[PDB]
Subunit: 235 residues, 4 copies
Amino acid sequence: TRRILVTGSSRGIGKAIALQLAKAGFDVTVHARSRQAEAEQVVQEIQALGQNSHYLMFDVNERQTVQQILEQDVEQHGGFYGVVLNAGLTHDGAFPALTDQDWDEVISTSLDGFYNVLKPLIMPMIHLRKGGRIVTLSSVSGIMGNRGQVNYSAAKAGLIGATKALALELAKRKITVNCVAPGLIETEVKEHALKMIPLQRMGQVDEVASVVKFLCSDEASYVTRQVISVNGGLI
Amino acid sequence: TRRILVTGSSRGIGKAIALQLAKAGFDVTVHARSRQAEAEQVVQEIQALGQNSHYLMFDVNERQTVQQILEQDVEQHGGFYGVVLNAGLTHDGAFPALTDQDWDEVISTSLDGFYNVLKPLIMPMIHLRKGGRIVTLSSVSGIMGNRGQVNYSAAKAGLIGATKALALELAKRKITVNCVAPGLIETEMDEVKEHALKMIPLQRMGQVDEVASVVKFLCSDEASYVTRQVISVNGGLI
Amino acid sequence: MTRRILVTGSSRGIGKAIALQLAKAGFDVTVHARSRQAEAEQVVQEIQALGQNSHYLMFDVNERQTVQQILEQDVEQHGGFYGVVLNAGLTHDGAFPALTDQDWDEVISTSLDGFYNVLKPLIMPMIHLRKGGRIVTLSSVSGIMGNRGQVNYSAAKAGLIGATKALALELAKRKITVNCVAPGLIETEVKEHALKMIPLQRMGQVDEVASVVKFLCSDEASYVTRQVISVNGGLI
Amino acid sequence: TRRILVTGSSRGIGKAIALQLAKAGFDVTVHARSRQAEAEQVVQEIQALGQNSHYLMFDVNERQTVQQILEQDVEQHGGFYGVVLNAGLTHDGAFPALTDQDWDEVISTSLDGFYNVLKPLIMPMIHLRKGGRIVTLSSVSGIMGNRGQVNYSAAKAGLIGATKALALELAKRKITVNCVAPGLIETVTDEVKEHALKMIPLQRMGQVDEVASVVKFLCSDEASYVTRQVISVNGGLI
Ligand SMILES: NC(=O)C1=CN([C@@H]2O[C@H](COP(=O)(O)OP(=O)(O)OC[C@H]3O[C@@H](n4cnc5c(N)ncnc54)[C@H](OP(=O)(O)O)[C@@H]3O)[C@@H](O)[C@H]2O)C=CC1
Ligand SMILES: NC(=O)C1=CN([C@@H]2O[C@H](COP(=O)(O)OP(=O)(O)OC[C@H]3O[C@@H](n4cnc5c(N)ncnc54)[C@H](OP(=O)(O)O)[C@@H]3O)[C@@H](O)[C@H]2O)C=CC1
């Protein structure tokens, strides 16, 4: 059974992605950085849906640790057919007010996390000889920029550049590589949503997960190199 | 049962869209300009799947005829929950070589067609009080341009602008409005297969169902937060 | 002989500012208007006082055969145009259900019929100069992103972008660059809405748009083609 | 006189930018990582053009060293009115074949370089109370991605997002912030020349001044309503 890894799937959008993929019939490996009990709960819910699941715990920034965990996981359970890079991080503030840690942790969590998670997994995916699916989670801010988020905008835009480049490299292997860029998602804010978003509301996590689930499906086999915005018309 | 009109659904991409929407559980109205026998065949295939279906024949450029046919159809069968504007036209040629007919017929079929079909249908859709779905079919050419296709590029680009603007107007009524922009799709048919191997990252033309599946997803209840978008289904071309 | 540029809709507004800047850059500039002949002649006088040759042409860009006859005769008398700026445009705003047939048709055709009707008689005279060339279309932020009450105008301005990009591909081998300038909200004749919605907190001035067109028409912009350049104060 | 810092301006695109800005009437501070003699030659050319100039030497990745050099320079010569961030590095290779150094050096040179150079300079620019100009140099690869360049594409795409976000924060100060994305620029074998002939609509690589002229326009007073933009100078590539 084809297996998909979803980073940051203990709660929020990542959890909703993991559950939709399980309902689609994929085996789903859960992941979290520190919330082991939440990850275990999602694992139980996936197993209740009739699919195999377990969790892995790592900070996507710990390069050598992520490699050891993923290589051991692929040896024990086979290569991943799909990977969803969902875990991200914000440290908001005006650009001259950002600290070094504000900047570095935000950039690396996205861009080093891309390298650290996917580099060990590309050849095991290719070796399944059945195509594959990679989906990254960016943001409206990675497309357009946002005040107080020069670091987050850079990180999520860089994720887009990496995703499009990787799509070109993996296309001949029938592996599609796409990005989903959510808008404002519910995880006086309702008044801002009423005023600024054409649909007049924040998105729900399943409205994002549905797009990821579609891209991971066999039906989406001619969609690659794309950034798909799920943002209620914001841009 | 929610009903969806698919223009140009007698064959090709539009037929695949129509069959996929029927399989998702929509009643589907088939449309063609002149190929009535193929339209009748698609209607029968949709009926055989367990959904209601009939066909409408019109040229989308005949503004007053289209209005009369659609108003009578809505009177008889209720408002459309969805409209997929798939019917299109090319007349390729270098810009100095294009004739008036080459230019006018390509621009109008996309832009007159958008107006002529949607204008009679907006209020019947809103009156359903359950949201709605509008999907237009553009092209990679409407995003980036293409040699020999200044007319088609303008026509398909103009469809993107109209789609995005209408998305803004209809969002408060829970009607999403999106565009699907295919790349090179195999609709039938050695040179064009080698051209696909070199130019397209996936190294092949797309199949009609690979376009129809994206349209089907956008028409589904699960795509309720996607609007104002151009979704490219092009094998990585751009 | 001096390179000559046609600016449609240059009797007033953005098109006038474009014509004056192109004259100051040393082009001969031909002024055009649909009906405001007195204003066209005043722009011609200013271009002449600026030191360049100028005259005006009057036509509705939708009158395909009349446009063809006027442009053919003008090129016969004065030579091919090195540049063409398609600036003249038209809005008929309103919610989509409120638009009349005329609201829709006049807006679509003024941009897309105008593109075809003005450029078809001029492309070969431009190519036959054998010195490259410049074509610039005026779109809008609405043609990129859409705007409420402007389904017709967004379609018209987005269609212009597609035409521009495709023609850039066809003409690149002749060293004719083809680009689009997409202004945001420009002051030509609300002020509080500008302060709230535009990062620069103000409307643009006509010369801020004209400066981009002038730059694209310059010899220095020889490697820029197929582009949509937004002049919008940060709006998108 | 308004002063502009151009990073990596001892040769190539950066040198062409520095010279064009001096001819436009700006004082221009040259920069290089190690090529000290080349930097001094550019300084002398700018002085001969009639503007004030000197050079600064640093690796944009050396965060605290850059901060100390720039703080001292602003102390001695005043805040910069403009900054042109020309800081990039490639380490090409198939993605699963990239080393840690291939990845990290490319990401950091662009994104650490943005932070390390611009953070010390934002407040001194604002304190001029005269507006300002920031231009970053990206690449067509940062817009569409490129095979063998997952690292460079991510680096150059991250620069675009940082630039757009910073444009939003500084717009109220009349500081415009824009990105220039060159295509293939002649900075050449027979193979490279032939690949330019076929991929690029203009059928040639760009020259350094064709890029510098766009930077120079953006830095001019006339470009005062252009901000948050990525302007591609690529011969029609995309
Ligand atoms: N095929 C491709 O590679 C690509 C296609 N597209 C777009 O996808 C859509 C479908 O592509 P394709 O499958 O080629 O279908 P076509 O674009 O070939 O149009 C075929 C359908 O449109 C109908 N049609 C054509 N002109 C009119 C008109 N004036 N009034 C009413 N109906 C009309 C035809 O009716 P009849 O059967 O009676 O002739 C037929 O049902 C089009 O919008 C096309 O531009 C975009 C990118 C690539
Ligand atoms: N002003 C703004 O805020 C913005 C404008 N734009 C675009 O910039 C361009 C100029 O804008 P603006 O300065 O407002 O001027 P307009 O767009 O109102 O066009 C005015 C000029 O176009 C001419 N014109 C109008 N219709 C026709 C026609 N059918 N045939 C021939 N000439 C015609 C007028 O001629 P006469 O003088 O005889 O009437 C006048 O010279 C347009 O393309 C517009 O869409 C885009 C974004 C914002």
